[PDB]
Amino acid sequence: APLGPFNATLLEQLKNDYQKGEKEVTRYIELQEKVAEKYIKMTPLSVTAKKKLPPSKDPRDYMTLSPYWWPDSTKIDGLPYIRKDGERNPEVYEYPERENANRFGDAAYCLGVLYYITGKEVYAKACANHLRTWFTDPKLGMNPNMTYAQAVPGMKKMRGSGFIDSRRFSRALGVAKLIEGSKSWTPSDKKKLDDWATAFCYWMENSTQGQRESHAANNHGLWYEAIHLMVLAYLDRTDRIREVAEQSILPKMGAQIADDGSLPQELKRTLSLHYSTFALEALMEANQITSQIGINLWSTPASNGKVASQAVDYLYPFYLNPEDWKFKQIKPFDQSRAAILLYEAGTALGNQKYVDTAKRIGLKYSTSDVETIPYLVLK
Amino acid sequence: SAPLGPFNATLLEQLKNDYQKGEKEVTRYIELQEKVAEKYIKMTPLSVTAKKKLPPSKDPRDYMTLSPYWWPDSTKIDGLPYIRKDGERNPEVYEYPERENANRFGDAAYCLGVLYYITGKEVYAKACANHLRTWFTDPKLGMNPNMTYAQAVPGMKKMRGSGFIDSRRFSRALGVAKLIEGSKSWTPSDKKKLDDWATAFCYWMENSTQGQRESHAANNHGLWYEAIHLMVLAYLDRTDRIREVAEQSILPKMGAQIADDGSLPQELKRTLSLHYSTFALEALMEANQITSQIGINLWSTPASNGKVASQAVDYLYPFYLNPEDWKFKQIKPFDQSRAAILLYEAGTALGNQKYVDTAKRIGLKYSTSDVETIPYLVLK
Ligand SMILES: O=C(O)[C@@H]1O[C@@H](O[C@H]2[C@H](O)[C@H](O)[C@H](O[C@H]3[C@H](O)[C@H](O)[C@H](O)O[C@H]3C(=O)O)O[C@H]2C(=O)O)[C@@H](O)[C@@H](O)[C@@H]1O
Ligand SMILES: O=C(O)C1=C[C@H](O)[C@H](O)[C@H](O[C@H]2[C@H](O)[C@H](O)[C@H](O[C@H]3[C@H](O)[C@H](O)[C@H](O)O[C@H]3C(=O)O)O[C@H]2C(=O)O)O1
């Protein structure tokens, strides 16, 4: 499979069994095709579909509200907003690209993966329509920056924390590699998207917000590099992937994993079991890419000997019994998010207990959740 | 005496008197409230018709919302029929603009009407009236007097009345319209149209199948149904029905929902059981504000089965002191501040000084813009 943001071993396995006519996989993929029909019909979304413009006056600039920031009722105008960690302010739904970037990413990811498995041009054609409109269209495509992501009303300082919103469309950028060679994805489409991704990568690496987010000491820094690797893999910069893993990701794990395997930065959050998991999910998506060029992020040590498997070990009994979690968790933890994580970490580590638990938790066979498409092994 | 309506009339009367006498503490407080209310003077009046997705009637004037705990079923190709996840609000609710717009309207109209009653400034009555006309009576922008499509659920086959509870945000604004009668801005023609709207809404509430079913609900839905009912009846000056509703529906429902230890078993089985225990009593509290203005105290009057609402407060009081000791499901954090007004209301009605003290110790923030706290300077 081409380099991209997915378990390549599982995708290659699905395509091969589908091409041999294997009954269980053929039936599974035929279910997924029924699920994907809505994305063939879906009108492509654009970041420009908003009324309230960002301070640039440019509808092509992505803008969202940082989700944990609320108006202050003791201020006459509610300004400046104040932080309530773990409490999502419903005002976030006033910025259409918060949910539309998710809907776009799901649509393009599903369609590109189904084109890779089946070879049906109808999937590449629809994938291409979503990609062109979200990324490259000179009127409807988004500017390659995250300047106004997770803005906060009244906040004086610039922040890079909104960059983490990019993971919702950077997975779609990576899956675009899967539709290269189709009739629908022309050399002109590829050149424009190569150019967009080059500009997005430039902004990521050199803007102040990008720089600050690259140095964040919690899951923001881990997710930044997961996104970075998606952009770099799209652009075939395998040398850069090696450098990022060795000079950013591994040092970050070494600093963020404690000696007992806990993630102290996540333990002080109000949703601490969720944010411990979210950190490892960032490592999990990074590893899907690094392991396609021979770097296993679950078992490769930092310079201090700490390994990401130690973080899984610490959390494993709490994936078995979330009720035993002893740190602040002000909403219930969804055990199901452990399923793909424990499968990913278990296979990478040869840890059969992890894989068994991933299957016992499982995923629903007929779920339409697009990220579960490769994981028939869990359904 | 203040007009009959959905507010603590004793505190409102005391604010108006002190304000007219020039008392410093009250004058300063009301001047803050006036600064707060300025955004409502400028605010463009909202309308239920400001939606794109129309309801099955094809009438933009029909109120329609999504029942908040119902979600697409990902294991179905079209996600239909939706399934219930108690206590987990599905963000799709924000696709129906009147969910939050009925809230914003209710806040604007309540604040402006209360401030006209306290200050006598015509500017507050004029703005209040603009919001009322647009939301209720306007022949194009005003809502139809029903809740047929409130809290609909995609794929659900049966009709439900559970969405009626959405009415409490605008029925409080209806009640406060009584406060602007006599202003120059609220004409006799305006009052007549709103009287006719409220009469039609009252008919729908009482005689539609959805209204009848909600009137029979065995949990906080039944209590909120009658709290809303009293607001409509008080707006219409039907003091006879207020007495009958209190004696024949509210007290028997309240008595039937209270267990031997004072707990509310219908609310204890919810995923937000401390919230829904509190929410049940808030319905009784708002109901009592109206009944006690004609001499019926719902906190201390026993039902015919011997149960009295004070017993429910007694059960919950230690958990307002320490919400973490709550031993039932509460999958999101409980806001202790919601205990403040509840304990003041129940404490004052019962002569329980322990409750009132706790109410002030928890307190409300002096400068808050929350319109429901306007009468409660005693807590600020
Ligand atoms: O005030 C409230 O409790 C409201 O809660 C939500 O309504 C709930 C509530 O449990 C209702 O009593 C009703 O429950 C029904 C329903 O059939 C439910 O599916 C289950 O079978 O129990 C029934 C019962 O208790 O008799 O509807 C529930 C629902 O989520 O639809 C909402 O109305 C909410 O807005 C309000 O806060
Ligand atoms: O942790 C996440 O991945 C995350 C996702 C949400 O979308 C949102 O970005 C949220 O971010 C919060 C997290 O604490 C960030 O690390 C940052 O925290 C900074 C913030 O200014 C905070 O008040 C304090 O100063 O810590 C800062 C830091 O850099 O640690 O933003 C948080 C926020 O809620 O904005 O979590």
Side-chain angles (χ1 to χ4, degrees):
Chain A
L3 190 60
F6 38 67
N7 187 312
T9 295
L10 292 174
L11 262 37
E12 296 152 357
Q13 169 207 278
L14 285 175
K15 181 181 190 159
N16 269 135
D17 294 4
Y18 175 86
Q19 284 178 345
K20 280 311 222 77
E22 199 266 29
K23 177 181 222 169
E24 175 194 77
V25 167
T26 296
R27 300 198 347 261
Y28 174 72
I29 292 302
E30 282 165 353
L31 170 62
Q32 302 304 317
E33 291 173 300
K34 271 64 179 290
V35 174
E37 283 173 21
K38 64 187 184 277
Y39 298 130
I40 299 175
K41 306 296 94 185
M42 180 185 159
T43 296
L45 299 167
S46 163
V47 84
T48 69
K50 51 172 163 277
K51 190 239 76 180
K52 201 166 57 225
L53 291 195
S56 60
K57 312 174 191 314
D58 195 340
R60 298 171 68 198
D61 281 329
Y62 181 105
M63 176 170 207
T64 54
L65 166 71
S66 191
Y68 298 148
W69 293 82
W70 299 70
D72 188 342
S73 308
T74 80
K75 302 283 169 289
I76 183 59
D77 55 7
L79 291 178
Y81 276 29
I82 59 184
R83 181 167 178 266
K84 300 187 185 297
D85 186 21
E87 301 180 46
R88 191 191 309 304
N89 177 1
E91 295 192 314
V92 296
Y93 301 109
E94 291 166 21
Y95 303 75
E97 51 265 71
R98 174 200 164 92
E99 290 312 315
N100 287 343
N102 262 333
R103 291 176 187 116
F104 156 69
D106 287 349
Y109 185 87
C110 166
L111 294 161
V113 165
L114 279 195
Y115 173 75
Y116 171 81
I117 291 167
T118 77
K120 295 180 174 172
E121 186 63 35
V122 70
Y123 295 125
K125 181 169 167 243
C127 189
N129 281 332
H130 289 279
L131 291 168
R132 269 186 221 100
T133 309
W134 184 266
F135 286 123
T136 54
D137 190 275
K139 299 188 157 276
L140 303 173
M142 80 176 276
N143 292 326
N145 72 74
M146 295 289 272
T147 298
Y148 297 112
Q150 294 197 27
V152 173
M155 186 178 275
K156 217 149 294 274
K157 75 178 247 118
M158 169 171 80
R159 296 182 320 152
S161 312
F163 186 72
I164 205 158
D165 284 15
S166 304
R167 76 195 181 279
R168 305 175 191 155
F169 56 77
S170 71
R171 307 167 175 123
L173 174 65
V175 167
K177 215 63 173 177
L178 300 185
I179 69 169
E180 295 182 359
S182 67
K183 182 192 85 205
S184 301
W185 195 240
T186 76
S188 167
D189 287 325
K190 169 171 164 53
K191 181 243 195 322
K192 290 173 189 145
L193 190 59
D194 286 356
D195 291 338
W196 187 94
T198 298
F200 189 75
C201 191
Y202 187 88
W203 185 89
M204 267 191 88
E205 291 179 347
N206 301 277
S207 76
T208 299
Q209 287 164 290
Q211 291 181 57
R212 290 188 187 156
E213 189 78 334
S214 71
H215 297 314
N218 63 356
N219 68 261
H220 273 265
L222 302 179
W223 272 109
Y224 170 98
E225 301 300 2
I227 294 161
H228 202 186
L229 294 188
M230 291 184 217
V231 174
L232 295 168
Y234 174 78
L235 296 173
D236 294 326
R237 295 186 187 161
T238 62
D239 60 332
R240 297 285 295 117
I241 294 171
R242 293 187 192 277
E243 290 155 19
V244 164
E246 292 149 74
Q247 312 180 357
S248 180
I249 297 176
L250 293 170
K252 273 174 179 54
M253 305 188 325
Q256 288 177 37
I257 297 177
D259 292 338
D260 63 357
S262 65
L263 300 157
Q265 283 331 283
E266 314 309 332
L267 295 184
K268 69 180 288 219
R269 302 298 293 282
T270 65
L271 300 165
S272 55
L273 181 52
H274 158 69
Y275 278 123
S276 292
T277 304
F278 196 51
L280 294 194
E281 273 159 343
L283 280 169
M284 170 192 88
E285 290 192 24
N287 177 74
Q288 291 178 340
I289 286 174
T290 64
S291 71
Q292 287 167 49
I293 65 160
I295 297 175
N296 187 326
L297 291 175
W298 291 110
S299 60
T300 301
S303 67
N304 67 357
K306 296 170 167 175
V307 287
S309 56
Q310 288 172 288
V312 187
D313 298 336
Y314 180 81
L315 296 163
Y316 181 79
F318 306 104
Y319 291 149
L320 292 190
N321 278 79
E323 58 285 10
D324 303 332
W325 184 249
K326 302 297 181 187
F327 299 91
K328 215 182 174 164
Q329 177 67 34
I330 65 171
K331 285 181 340 170
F333 173 70
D334 200 328
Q335 182 195 235
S336 77
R337 279 299 85 215
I340 290 165
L341 178 58
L342 285 177
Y343 177 83
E344 287 282 333
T347 62
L349 292 161
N351 190 313
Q352 179 50 74
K353 186 183 67 173
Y354 293 176
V355 170
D356 287 341
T357 294
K359 299 194 198 168
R360 182 147 52 246
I361 300 176
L363 307 169
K364 293 158 299 201
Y365 175 83
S366 50
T367 185
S368 60
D369 305 337
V370 298
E371 77 278 17
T372 76
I373 288 174
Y375 298 92
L376 173 56
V377 293
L378 298 179
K379 303 172 180 181
Chain B
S1 183
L4 280 187
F7 37 68
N8 186 311
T10 294
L11 293 171
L12 274 198
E13 292 155 355
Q14 174 188 59
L15 286 172
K16 185 185 192 331
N17 257 267
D18 293 2
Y19 176 86
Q20 283 177 159
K21 290 311 171 81
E23 304 187 355
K24 171 65 180 188
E25 174 72 12
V26 164
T27 297
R28 154 84 273 149
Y29 175 71
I30 294 303
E31 279 165 351
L32 171 60
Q33 303 302 316
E34 290 171 300
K35 274 195 258 287
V36 172
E38 192 68 42
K39 64 186 185 278
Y40 298 128
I41 294 177
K42 303 166 218 142
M43 178 186 159
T44 296
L46 296 165
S47 162
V48 83
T49 67
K51 51 167 83 81
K52 62 293 207 184
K53 198 168 139 166
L54 293 193
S57 59
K58 312 175 191 314
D59 192 340
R61 298 170 69 197
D62 279 327
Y63 182 106
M64 179 169 180
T65 56
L66 166 72
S67 189
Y69 299 148
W70 292 82
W71 298 68
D73 188 341
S74 79
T75 81
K76 305 287 167 179
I77 289 295
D78 53 5
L80 291 175
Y82 277 29
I83 59 83
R84 178 166 175 267
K85 299 190 280 143
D86 190 23
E88 301 180 48
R89 182 188 299 133
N90 175 359
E92 294 192 313
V93 296
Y94 302 113
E95 292 164 21
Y96 305 76
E98 53 266 69
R99 174 201 164 93
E100 289 310 314
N101 284 345
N103 255 329
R104 298 177 202 274
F105 159 70
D107 287 349
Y110 187 86
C111 166
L112 295 163
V114 166
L115 279 193
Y116 170 74
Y117 169 81
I118 289 166
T119 75
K121 296 180 174 172
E122 187 64 36
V123 72
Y124 294 125
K126 182 170 102 113
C128 185
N130 280 335
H131 291 280
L132 291 168
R133 269 186 221 99
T134 308
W135 186 266
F136 285 125
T137 56
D138 187 79
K140 292 189 151 276
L141 304 170
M143 78 176 276
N144 291 327
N146 70 73
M147 296 291 275
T148 300
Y149 297 111
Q151 294 196 27
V153 173
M156 184 179 277
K157 309 177 145 294
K158 84 170 111 167
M159 167 171 79
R160 296 179 322 153
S162 310
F164 187 71
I165 205 159
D166 284 16
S167 305
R168 76 196 182 280
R169 298 152 177 162
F170 56 76
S171 72
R172 190 173 60 175
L174 172 64
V176 167
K178 191 60 61 166
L179 298 183
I180 69 167
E181 294 179 358
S183 67
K184 299 166 276 168
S185 300
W186 196 241
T187 74
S189 165
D190 288 326
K191 172 175 167 56
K192 180 231 195 314
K193 290 169 192 142
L194 187 57
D195 286 356
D196 291 339
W197 188 94
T199 297
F201 191 76
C202 189
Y203 186 95
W204 186 90
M205 270 189 91
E206 292 180 348
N207 298 277
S208 75
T209 298
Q210 288 164 288
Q212 292 179 57
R213 289 188 186 156
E214 190 79 334
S215 70
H216 301 150
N219 64 353
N220 69 263
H221 271 266
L223 301 182
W224 271 110
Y225 171 98
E226 298 299 359
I228 296 158
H229 202 188
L230 294 185
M231 289 183 218
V232 172
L233 299 168
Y235 174 76
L236 294 169
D237 298 333
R238 295 188 190 162
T239 58
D240 57 321
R241 296 249 56 232
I242 293 175
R243 179 168 290 102
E244 287 156 18
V245 167
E247 299 297 352
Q248 315 181 2
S249 183
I250 295 177
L251 292 170
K253 267 178 177 52
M254 204 55 275
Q257 286 173 35
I258 299 176
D260 290 337
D261 61 356
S263 64
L264 303 162
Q266 280 322 104
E267 315 308 331
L268 294 185
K269 198 77 225 89
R270 301 296 292 281
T271 62
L272 301 162
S273 55
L274 180 51
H275 158 71
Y276 277 117
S277 289
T278 303
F279 196 53
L281 293 194
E282 274 160 344
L284 205 85
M285 168 188 87
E286 292 189 23
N288 178 73
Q289 289 176 340
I290 289 174
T291 63
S292 71
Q293 287 166 47
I294 66 159
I296 297 176
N297 186 324
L298 295 180
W299 293 109
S300 60
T301 300
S304 262
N305 70 351
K307 296 297 200 300
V308 44
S310 58
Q311 291 175 296
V313 189
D314 301 335
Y315 178 82
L316 294 162
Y317 179 79
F319 305 105
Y320 293 153
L321 290 189
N322 282 85
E324 312 85 31
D325 299 328
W326 185 249
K327 299 297 186 191
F328 299 92
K329 216 181 299 299
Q330 177 67 34
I331 66 170
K332 284 181 220 198
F334 175 73
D335 199 337
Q336 185 195 42
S337 79
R338 285 199 313 162
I341 292 167
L342 179 57
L343 285 176
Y344 179 82
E345 289 280 330
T348 306
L350 290 161
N352 189 316
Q353 189 53 45
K354 187 184 67 172
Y355 291 174
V356 173
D357 288 341
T358 295
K360 298 193 198 169
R361 198 219 62 219
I362 299 175
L364 308 169
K365 293 154 160 77
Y366 176 85
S367 46
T368 185
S369 57
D370 307 336
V371 300
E372 70 284 16
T373 74
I374 291 174
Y376 297 95
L377 172 54
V378 284
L379 297 181
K380 303 171 179 180

